[PDB]
Amino acid sequence: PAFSPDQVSVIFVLGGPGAGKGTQCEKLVKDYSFVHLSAGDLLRAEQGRAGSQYGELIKNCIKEGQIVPQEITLALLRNAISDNVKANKHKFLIDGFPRKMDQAISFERDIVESKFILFFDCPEDIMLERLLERGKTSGRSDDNIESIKKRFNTFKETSMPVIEYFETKSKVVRVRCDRSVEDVYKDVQDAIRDSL
Ligand SMILES: Nc1ncnc2c1ncn2[C@@H]1O[C@H](COP(=O)(O)OP(=O)(O)O)[C@@H](O)[C@H]1O
Ligand SMILES: Nc1ncnc2c1ncn2[C@@H]1O[C@H](COP(=O)(O)O)[C@@H](O)[C@H]1O
């Protein structure tokens, strides 16, 4: 791997869209030394980057709730991790990655093996109400019912197998998403304290 788990500590934060990953990660960075890297954010940044040859591809993948090819995704993640390590940041909360088996195996084999996966176990009806609310609040392009259904489908068909994979390696820590932000955070903190 490009790094050893001693140089770079990686916690994958997984769960379906609207499970509260971004919300919890943002709280965690206030209390812990972790750097929060969001795959969705990295992709959205590249999508709007002047001169990007991936603008249309990412735009379409996001609207359709599709998994952007790992080559593009991994490259953006690797660059962000590198910039941080350079700046002496060695602990990362990578939210929303890996979402497909290929990128999961490539990441762990070429970059670094993750410490553990923090999985936000969330009922779909809960995720759905949060995304519709978020759609109104923030106006993210894909926070519309048509794209949301596609995101849930992809999550179940494509992303869940990744959770099952890491689960067999005993690296998954499940946290229930369906509580208040503060109550969920308490469990997140407990999981992290126990998992370090
Ligand atoms: N525990 C929670 N209870 C209620 N609303 C929440 C909770 N966690 C996050 N939210 C929110 O619901 C939406 C989805 O959370 P978010 O963190 O954005 O999700 P994710 O990153 O998993 O897609 C956001 O509008 C956010 O404010
Ligand atoms: N790990 C990933 N690999 C590939 N595409 C991704 C990944 N994460 C996010 N995307 C995409 O970008 C969209 C928004 O992600 P998010 O903001 O996490 O909801 C997703 O629905 C996919 O289209």
Swiss-Prot record:
Major site of localization recorded for this protein: cytoplasm
Binding site for a ribonucleoside 5'-phosphate: 44, 66-68, 96-99, 103, 140, 151
Needed cofactors: Mg(2+)
Protein localization: Cytoplasm; Nucleus
pH dependence of activity: Optimum pH is 6-9.5.
Enzyme class, UniProt record, top EC level: transferase
Superkingdom of origin: Eukaryota
PROSITE patterns: ADENYLATE_KINASE
Cofactor info, note text: Binds 1 Mg(2+) ion per monomer.
E.C. number: 2.7.4.14
Binding site for ATP: 18-23, 134, 179
BP GO terms, sorted: 'de novo' pyrimidine nucleobase biosynthetic process; CDP biosynthetic process; nucleobase-containing compound metabolic process; UDP biosynthetic process
Keyword annotations from UniProtKB, A to Z: ATP-binding, Cytoplasm, Kinase, Nucleotide-binding, Nucleus, Pyrimidine biosynthesis, Transferase
LID: annotated segments: 133-143
Pfam families assigned to the protein according to its UniProt record, in alphabetical order: ADK
CDD domains: ADK
NMP: annotated segments: 38-68
An example Gene Ontology CC term for this record: cytoplasm
Family of the protein in this entry: Belongs to the adenylate kinase family. UMP-CMP kinase subfamily.
Biological function: Catalyzes the phosphorylation of pyrimidine nucleoside monophosphates at the expense of ATP. Plays an important role in de novo pyrimidine nucleotide biosynthesis. Has preference for UMP and dUMP as phosphate acceptors, but can also use CMP, dCMP, AMP, GMP, dGMP and dTMP. ATP and dATP are the best phosphate donors, but can also use GTP, dGTP, dCTP, and dTTP to some degree.
Other remarks in the entry: Present with 1500 molecules/cell in log phase SD medium.
Entry text on domains: Consists of three domains, a large central CORE domain and two small peripheral domains, NMPbind and LID, which undergo movements during catalysis. The LID domain closes over the site of phosphoryl transfer upon ATP binding. Assembling and dissambling the active center during each catalytic cycle provides an effective means to prevent ATP hydrolysis.
Name of the molecule in the record: Uridylate kinase
Originating organism: Saccharomyces cerevisiae (strain ATCC 204508 / S288c)
Gene symbol of the encoding locus: URA6
